[PDB]
């Protein structure tokens, strides 16, 4: 019934701007304080900003004060985070959260949205190259190296979704190039090699890269 | 700001187990402490508010208590759905601050990694870089050490490791380690070796290939 859904975000340059939006359904929006919380890749949770139901009172983390503005439109059930002077500090998944704040309880983030990714970098959008991971007992491994893309995310399947068991797709790493890389691997019978074709399917929507890579 | 320190950072336990996660505040915050649960690839959810009060739909096996600077989250009889990362969060004052998190993973039978090494492709070399990959597959526990050796010389700090979340079928992990060199550096050495140490191995396992 109750739902929050974040829009906006994407890749921006340092010094740049964004506006996140959060659409509320299934509760009386004007009666509830709302909050933005963010989560940097592979890190914990950090409070960004909160706003009273009325929109009159705002509150900010010191690191974002006078760069970010929290606002809301009670008429259209929408919460905003306007972001200015962005820096890489700000790269994170941003969540909006309904914030009841009862007397003798304080603020509680009782319902959270799905999250939207903000990436701040001097690097421009770049599609990956997809290289094979091949052998140089009974189990063998193969995979695809999805190298030098930006920003996140990428998705990988195998044999167009016909192969899923024994599949592992790793979280990306940030390289010294400032670009991402990840691998997706599968284990198969060593017998089945050179007999059945294994294909990895890589989608990087930011660059409109969509690749099928024959591995073996 | 009010610094929140959770203990432990990481916790391995089994179904049926009773575990306690501690959260300490750098100053008194009375009972204004919430707990959240987060599963991989998902947003957090509220578990407990004001130290002790259960959110609707949270099982009674979760209990919290504390007031001042020391707080406890006790999960009695752990169930499979309870394995997750847990955060505390103070609401005494802005800025609202969170603990660094406690990753609660499920224990299972030790499993040594299956180790695989992959050479750079010709396609990559033509591009002017060379990435060598070592896979540690389907192992438990998470703690593994990968030591690259290039013509017998130890490497350290020049590879990138990534680990999967605990597998939903069998509660194992996998790990990838990527060694990246310029085409030139790659073509100056012969033997590329990945040497693996893990609880499940009585001595290290080495996978190697000679360039070509």
């Amino acid at each position: 019934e109750v739902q929050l859904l974040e829009s906006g975000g994407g890749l921006v340059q340092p010094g740049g701007s964004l506006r996140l939006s959060c659409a509320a359904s299934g509760f009386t929006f004007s009666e509830r304080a709302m909050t933005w919380v963010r989560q940097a890749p592979g890190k914990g949770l950090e409070w960004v900003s909160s706003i009273s139901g009325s929109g009159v009172k705002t509150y900010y983390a010191d690191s974002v004060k006078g760069r970010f503005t929290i606002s809301r439109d009670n008429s259209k059930n929408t919460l905003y985070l306007q972001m200015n002077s962005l820096r890489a500090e700000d790269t994170a998944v941003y969540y909006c959260a309904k914030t009841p704040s009862p007397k003798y309880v304080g603020s509680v983030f009782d319902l959270w949205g799905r999250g939207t990714l903000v990436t701040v970098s001097s690097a421009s959008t770049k599609g990956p190259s997809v290289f094979p991971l091949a052998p140089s007992g009974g189990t063998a491994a193969l995979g695809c190296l999805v190298k030098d893309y930006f920003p996140e995310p990428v998705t990988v399947s195998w044999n167009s979704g016909a192969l899923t068991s024994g599949v592992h797709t790793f979280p990306a790493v940030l390289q010294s190039s400032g670009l991402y890389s990840l691998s997706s691997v599968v284990t198969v019978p060593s017998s089945s090699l050179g007999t059945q074709t294994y294909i990895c399917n890589v989608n990087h929507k930011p660059s409109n890269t969509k690749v099928d890579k024959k591995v073996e | 700001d009010i610094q929140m320190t959770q203990s432990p950072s990481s916790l391995s336990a089994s179904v049926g187990d009773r575990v306690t996660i501690t959260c300490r505040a750098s100053q008194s915050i009375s009972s204004y402490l919430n707990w959240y649960q987060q599963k991989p690839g998902k947003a957090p959810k509220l578990l407990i508010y004001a130290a002790s009060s259960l959110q609707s739909g949270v099982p009674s096996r979760f209990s919290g208590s504390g007031s001042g600077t020391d707080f406890t989250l006790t999960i009695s009889s752990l169930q499979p759905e309870d394995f997750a990362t847990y955060y505390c969060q103070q609401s005494y004052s802005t800025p609202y601050t969170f603990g660094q998190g406690t990753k609660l993973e499920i224990k299972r039978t030790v499993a040594a990694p299956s180790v695989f090494i992959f050479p750079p492709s010709d396609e990559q070399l033509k591009s002017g870089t060379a990435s060598v990959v070592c896979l540690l597959n389907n192992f438990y526990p998470r703690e593994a050490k990968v030591q690259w050796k290039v013509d017998n010389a130890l490497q350290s700090g020049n590879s990138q490791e990534s680990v999967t979340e605990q597998d939903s079928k069998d509660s194992t992990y996998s790990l990838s380690s990527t060694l990246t060199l310029s085409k030139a550096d790659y073509e100056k050495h012969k033997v590329y070796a990945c040497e693996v140490t893990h609880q499940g191995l009585s001595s290290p396992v080495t996978k190697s290939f000679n360039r070509g």
Binding site: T28, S30, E31, R32, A33, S50, S52, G53, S54, K57, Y59, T99, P100, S101, P102, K103, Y104, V105, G106, S107, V108, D110 | Q27, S28, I29, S30, Y32, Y49, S53, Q55, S56, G68, Y92, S93, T94
Partner: peptide, 17 residues
Amino acid sequence: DPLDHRDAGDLWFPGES
């Protein structure tokens, strides 16, 4: 529960520890 109490929607803060 208190999360349901309809109030003006302001943040509440305690006046003592």
